[PDB]
Amino acid sequence: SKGTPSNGKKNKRNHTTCCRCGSVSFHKQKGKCSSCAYPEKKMKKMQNRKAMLKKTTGTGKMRHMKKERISRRAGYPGNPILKEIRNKI
Amino acid sequence: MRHSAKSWGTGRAMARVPRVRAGGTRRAGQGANANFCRGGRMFAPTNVNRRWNRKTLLSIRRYASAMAVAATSIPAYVEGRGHRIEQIENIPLVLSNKIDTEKTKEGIKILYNLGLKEELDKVEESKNIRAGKGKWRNRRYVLKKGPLFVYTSETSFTKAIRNIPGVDTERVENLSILDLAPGGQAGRLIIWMEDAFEKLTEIYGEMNEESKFKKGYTM
Amino acid sequence: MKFNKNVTASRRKNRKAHFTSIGLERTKLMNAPLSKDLKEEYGIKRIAVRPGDMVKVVSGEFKKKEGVVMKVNRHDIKIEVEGCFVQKEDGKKINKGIHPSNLRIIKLSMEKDRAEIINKKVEAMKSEVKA
Amino acid sequence: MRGNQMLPNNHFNKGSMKFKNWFNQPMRALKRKEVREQKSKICYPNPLKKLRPVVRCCSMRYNKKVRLGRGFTKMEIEKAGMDIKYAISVGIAVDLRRKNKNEEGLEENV
Amino acid sequence: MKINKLNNASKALSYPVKKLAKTEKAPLTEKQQRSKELKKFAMSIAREVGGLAPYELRATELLRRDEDKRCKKFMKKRLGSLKMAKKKIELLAEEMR
RNA sequence: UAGGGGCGAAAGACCAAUCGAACAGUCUAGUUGCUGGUUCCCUCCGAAAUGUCUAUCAGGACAGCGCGCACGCAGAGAGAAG
RNA sequence: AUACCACACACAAGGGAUCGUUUGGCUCCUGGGACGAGGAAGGGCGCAGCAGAGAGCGAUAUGUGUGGGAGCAGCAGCAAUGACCACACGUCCCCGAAUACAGCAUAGUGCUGGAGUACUCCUUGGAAUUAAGCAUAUGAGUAAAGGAAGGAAAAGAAACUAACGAGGAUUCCCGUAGUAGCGGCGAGUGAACAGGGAACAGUCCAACAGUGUAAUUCUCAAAUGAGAAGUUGUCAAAAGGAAGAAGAUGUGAAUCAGAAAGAAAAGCUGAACGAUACAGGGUGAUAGUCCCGUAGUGUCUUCUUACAUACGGUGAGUAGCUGUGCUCGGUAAUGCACAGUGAAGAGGUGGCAGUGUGCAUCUAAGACUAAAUACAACAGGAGACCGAUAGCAAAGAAGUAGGUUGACCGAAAACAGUGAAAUUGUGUGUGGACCCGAAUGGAUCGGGCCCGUCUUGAAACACGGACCAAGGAGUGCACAUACACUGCAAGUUGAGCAGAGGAAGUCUGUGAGGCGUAGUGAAGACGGAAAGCAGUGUGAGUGCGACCCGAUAGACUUGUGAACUAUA
Ligand SMILES: [Zn+2]
């Protein structure tokens, strides 16, 4: 029967951890990730605005982008040992 | 309106309000979007398209300001607002030009000589913290209204008197009804400058004539 | 009246600026007045209280007392003064902290960099006073 | 629908319709003032605005009224003894599209 | 309603201006003449090198039989405009002569 | 091998406790002539369940009967006598 | 009724309402609009003396330099041989466009790819809904899906309007106008020139380059040589500047004492003092003079911007035509395409089909362009906004705890305040369901069926309701309208926009348009009664979620599923 007794046979596992996004959604037989479309070059279309804002720029650390803004503020000064190269250029 | 919600329909022994689709949390099966629901949407949400300002005819604005100015020289009205004028010799007050004052120290001595001491004291003693939620929204302290000084020509006296509590300043040419009738009751006490007092004849004209300064207006 | 529009007059903003202060701005919170004599001995009118300096308590329970500053709590803005304490049920004694502004300085601790700190402030005045 | 009225015709059916409010009106006025002021310093002795011709308005309804136009014609400028390069240097506006068809209109602009 | 009160006769009146005559531009300078000559010359060489197109042959054939009204209808359908047809017929006629 | 599509020794069976057209999310607060509900006090006036037309018969509109503001004013839900 | 059941009051339990408070939210305005092969955005894993989560940082996981200067929150230890902070730099593990790759250009060096996409441009393209049914039409060229760029983007100097006594690039605001018209002429749709302003700026290529010599660009050498591109055509000139704006930071006046009372005075009482500073915040109760500021004044650093040569009148599978499909208010074709057909050098247009002829106005099939205009992330300032069941989902380690096979889905919890009601125990009183009227020392007497709701008709064998708290439903805008109130009146008006002003307020100009000052007809045409305009509000109609809640269904996606079950 289709209820409790059929639950006993459910011991196989079709999805594993995706290497691009972490989300335990890589379908091994299809060769595709259901969250991010790996191995396609572009990321997947997200279903709605609510769901996509959960993965935008600024939801993580933004390491490089923050440093760039501080350097731009300072006038891109560079390493002080090498000022002469900068000044010539 | 954020959540994914749907009605369960009849046959489940429950009211047919929309409910939240979820699992693993106590939030499953709770009642979603309606105005009678916790965390739902308000009835007729407030909206930016409301009409904030109001029109008034220019002819009424001109007439109201004229009869507000008039009331500043009837003792019954001035006393009625709550300005105290027991010690003042006569109304209206007109200060001369050739006031060479630059310091607040000497400025107060002048105002005391015109009899204003009791009025000024009445303002200083008044400061209190407002009752209600307004004290959280940048409206913390309340003070009583005092004298308004009206000038027309630029003078040092303006920056000598301004730090004294309850003193207020405006030019005659752009004198406003909010300053002339606070709270919608008329008869504010006014210190005129000699130049400003003479200018009232150009501004409002003469009875059954037309003002040159206010085109299309007659008294 | 304030005529500069870059400075805030919001109650919410002024309060956050107080409690979340750090660095030099935190040091400004620990300032106290000098006595009349010291204001002739030195140019300064007020300084940040440090251990070892001598203070008169001018407000509160311990009014009129005099003593040496033992400790400076920067996180919970309080100073501990020698001989200002309460006794528990146990008989054990706990120093009670006083807010900086309720103190007045009577003698300065001149250990370490204090003499240079004072010099730096006096010069900063004269630089603009004489102009 | 009941009673006597002028029959409705109110066009609010389209759900994609945008609304425009004007809360910025006093502030944008203040910015336009401050831009003119600083522009006036950059060319201090000279007026901020150029000289423009007088032309006659268009239809039967406005024939009897005169108005400012875009620029003087090469013929107007020449008749008054100037050259085009000089006129520009002295703050006169120029429009080479306009034509002259009357004696009166020419005489006034000279 | 402030519309449709005057008659058409009175709407046609006009104010008495003084007009300026138009400046005629008839003189054509030496260099402009040579320019035009060279363009017209170039048009000869193309016709000499490459000859007539199929519908031009069919058209000129009808002109020899004096089938004037047939040629007119034919050319109208090829070029679209009755003006272009009238012009092209006149150019073809002159070529044959 | 995937949704107006699959697969079926054929029962409209089965396609993640869902199938005479799956699930997720959005358009969308889809529509409702139909059912349920609609939050303080006193004072004064006070109905209708009928006619005409309607894809009209559990609905509308127009007229008839209420109330408010009222320019004004010799009238009357009763009798006599021809 | 000894002990059960009910009610009242006092005390103890049980719960978290109410009042007082808020380093959070929301809305409007101003600035900003800064990513990546020099490896981004996003994911994982490591790093502390005792260290889980979160924050910070990369095996250099608190290093160097500059400016300052006192502690490191617990315990043990450190610190003028520099605790801690601020500015810049150095170092920067593994996965990921992920590349020892793909496509492509140059004499050579190289460039693209992924992320973001609120606002702008280019394609593709619904249905619910309204018509009280429905098929053309509407919603709507909207949603959805794809491509691309910048701080704005697009557009832009007439193959343009107009018929006046004419004007003169583009964009934006007021207006013509809910008009001319389109439409099962139904429902409904719907522009342009004028007239008043903001801001203003014009120019390039081809046609068409010295022939007494390619005079032109590049490479190596050298101080004057070799070589590459190119005759299928290269080559058409100036430095230069002070202004303007935004930030950062220094300084910065003036008070003491007292009875009563309180844990504590800044309150209250007396006596003083400052002010170009009485904006606001902190201190053990309500502070101009106790602390941080404010008015007024100094310094410094960045950014933006500016003079030269030569020319005209023919830019083709184009304009147009026939057929066809979509589109627009565009109507015997407004714009865009596809197939046939296909010009002239002279052509295009003048809101109704054709043919002819004068007249007016322009010059298509190649390119560039400032200012005035639009709006997320991030930063700053304001508010007749909300005050922990509200305001963002989120005032704490919130897109978290936790959940789906998957796409995706998603909470609660403020103060160690106050401490209501439901409900429970103990004590003391009064009754046997309770309400209204009237009383006794005391038995009781008389009257009353359970509320809300549809209904001719409810106590009903009609439906909803166990009990208490808190939340919980006729609102906002546009357009005509009748009434009440106000100013002026043959007139009336806060259009936008300019001038003044320590300013989202107020005052003053310039100056359109609209409606009114009289009507009749389809129109040509004619002409002869009746106070209006603009506001502040109330009743009422129509369109938008439209008093609040509620279908079975329809469509769209470059979204997901054969772990159960079917077949090869
Ligand atoms: Zn993935």
Coordinates of N, CA and C and ligand atoms in Angstrom, one line a residue, chain A residues 18 20-21 23 33 35-36 38, ligand 1:
Chain A
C18 N 26.6 20.4 -4.3 CA 27.1 21.2 -5.4 C 28.4 21.9 -5.1
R20 N 29.6 24.6 -6.7 CA 29.6 26.0 -7.0 C 28.8 26.8 -5.9
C21 N 27.7 26.2 -5.3 CA 26.8 27.0 -4.5 C 26.6 26.4 -3.1
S23 N 24.5 24.0 -2.1 CA 23.1 23.8 -1.6 C 22.6 22.3 -1.7
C33 N 22.7 20.9 -11.5 CA 22.3 21.4 -10.1 C 21.0 22.2 -10.2
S35 N 19.7 24.3 -8.0 CA 19.7 25.7 -7.5 C 20.4 26.7 -8.4
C36 N 21.5 26.3 -9.1 CA 22.4 27.2 -9.8 C 22.7 26.9 -11.2
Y38 N 24.8 24.7 -12.5 CA 26.1 24.1 -12.8 C 25.9 22.8 -13.5
Ligands
ZN1 ZN 24.6 24.6 -7.4

